[PDB]
């Protein structure tokens, strides 16, 4: 309450805006009542026998299983038989089908096919046995 709030108000509504102003008396007062795997590439495959063992750590096998763990939930993982007659580790492409039931049809197709659980893939004796022949084994993922 220091500035002229009326002089500006007097300039407005009078000089400009040409606004009609009327008292409009109280006429109605008096109203008459009127009465995840982007980097990986699929085609490579290698034996898994030292893919699991690492001289550094025993848990290296678990991270190898962790590669399967991402695929365990839907079960798309399937490794193919090489000359030894046992599944061989390889990388998997991203796969997609038309509708949500089409891939479901795909998964129960793989379950219907023969499953590779006759012998647990990681076993002690053969890994040493292959080391003695060619000393190759080796992991492709680390």
């Amino acid at each position: 309450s220091q500035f002229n709030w009326f002089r500006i108000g007097a300039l407005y509504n009078t000089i400009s805006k040409n606004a009609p102003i009327t008292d409009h008396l109280m006429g109605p007062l008096s109203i008459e009542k009127k009465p995840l795997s982007k980097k990986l590439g699929p085609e490579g495959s290698i034996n898994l026998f030292k893919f699991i063992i690492d001289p550094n750590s025993f848990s290296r096998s678990i991270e190898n299983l962790f590669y399967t763990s991402f695929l365990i939930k839907e079960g798309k993982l399937l490794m193919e038989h090489d000359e030894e007659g046992l599944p061989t580790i390889k990388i998997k492409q991203s796969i997609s089908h038309t509708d949500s039931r089409s891939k479901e049809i795909e998964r129960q197709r793989r379950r219907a096919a023969h499953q590779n659980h006759i012998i647990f893939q990681m076993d002690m004796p053969t890994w040493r046995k292959l080391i003695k022949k060619y000393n190759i084994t080796s992991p492709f993922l680390d």
Partner: protein, 394 residues
């Protein structure tokens, strides 16, 4: 050129929202597609015509089960009579803040969740980007999206509407203390009981003199820590209550009365929508049904921006409340939808209301079928129900 449907780009849509929904082999709808507005959604149709069935299917798709929504369990109702499998697909925006996901990268913006119901198989098997998973994964994803099914705030059903109708102040205190961490209330109750028993030992005394000072100091420190947070929360919720009740032309605030005993703190709601009704706690018998429904709906709306849930679901809400209270709550819903980045509500209108207000942001969906209209499956443009942007390019 060839007609192209609008691109379901999830980047434009707000996170946690749904663009396109696919409904396969359901009651009177074997092939249907639905488009949902980013701001807010409206579905028009009589109850029992499949609209409620479609909403329940959408709810069950995201790790939902019929008995976890406070309603009877009928799996066979969803399955089309004759068809083996009934399928619901729901797509949501993805952000790098949720773990335990299959096939979907963190930088990816798409989460596709599919639920299938079949008669022969009795198990909980869902699909994430078309990959079969147990219900545990989808359930923990739903948990990590800050959206809950059992809790009545995020999802509202007929039984939940009835439960809110007769709501006590103790329940308001419980929901307020469960929204924030509830450990503070438990600690303060422990301290107040310690104060009571210490005072009892003090009057018994009238080793004890050393007590009642450390206890009171700890109580004062706990109260000093607790007071400002709930004070600001109560002020914010009261301001939201007032700004949501302004359209009703009524004044109301969510007050937290705090007696000396911490457990005696209660919640008061001020009512002014009816001049005859005095200011009192919400209750069904004294107040009218429509005004109470509007008040509780507005209270639900107020506790939405603070919550991190992507959206809220309300059922049996647009059914007429006196055609006046329902009109004002629709006006409030329009005003809320005017603000951007708001939750999407799946609205249900069992009874048609004359002269309904339709905002430009929201879009109405109709599921009714006409005799002269061809079958939806045979007609390529009839698969979409209550959608107009699909016909136009982009």
């Amino acid at each position: 050129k060839r007609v192209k449907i609008a691109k379901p780009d999830l980047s434009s849509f707000q996170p946690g929202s749904i663009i396109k929904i696919r409904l396969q082999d359901f009651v009177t709808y074997t092939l249907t597609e639905f488009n949902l507005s980013p701001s807010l959604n409206m579905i028009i149709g009589p109850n029992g015509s499949g609209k409620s069935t479609f909403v329940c299917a959408v709810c069950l798709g995201l790790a939902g089960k019929p008995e976890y929504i406070g309603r009877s369990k009928k799996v066979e109702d969803f399955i089309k009579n004759g068809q083996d499998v009934s399928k619901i697909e729901i797509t949501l925006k993805n952000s790098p803040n949720v773990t335990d996901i299959e096939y979907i990268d963190a930088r990816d913006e798409t989460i596709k969740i599919t639920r299938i119901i079949t008669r022969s198989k009795r198990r909980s098997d869902y699909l994430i980007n078309d990959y079969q998973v147990s219900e545990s994964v989808v359930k923990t994803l739903v948990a990590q999206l800050n959206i809950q099914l059992d809790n009545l705030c995020q999802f509202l059903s007929q039984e939940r509407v009835e439960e809110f109708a007769r709501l006590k102040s103790v329940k308001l205190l419980v929901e307020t203390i469960r929204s924030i961490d509830a450990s503070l209330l438990d600690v303060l109750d422990e301290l107040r009981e310690l104060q009571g028993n210490e005072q009892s030992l003090q009057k018994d005394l009238d080793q004890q003199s050393k007590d009642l000072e450390t206890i009171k100091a700890k109580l004062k420190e706990d109260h000093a820590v607790l007071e400002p947070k709930l004070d600001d929360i109560v002020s914010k919720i009261s301001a939201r209550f007032a700004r949501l009740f302004n359209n009703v032309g009524s004044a109301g605030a969510v007050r937290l009365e705090k007696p000396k005993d911490y457990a005696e703190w209660k919640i008061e709601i001020m009512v002014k929508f009816r001049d005859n009704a005095p200011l009192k706690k919400l209750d069904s018998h004294t107040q009218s049904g429509g005004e109470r429904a509007v008040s509780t709906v507005l209270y639900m709306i107020a506790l939405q921006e603070f919550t991190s849930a992507p959206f809220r679901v309300v059922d049996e809400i647009n059914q007429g409340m006196d055609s006046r209270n329902e009109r004002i709550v629709h006006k409030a819903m329009v005003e809320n939808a005017c603000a951007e980045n708001t939750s999407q509500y799946f609205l249900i209108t069992p009874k048609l209301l004359t002269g309904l207000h339709y905002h430009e942001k929201m879009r109405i969906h109709c599921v009714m079928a006409g005799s002269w209209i061809p079958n939806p499956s045979e007609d390529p443009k009839m698969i979409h129900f209550g959608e107009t942007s699909n016909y136009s390019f982009d």
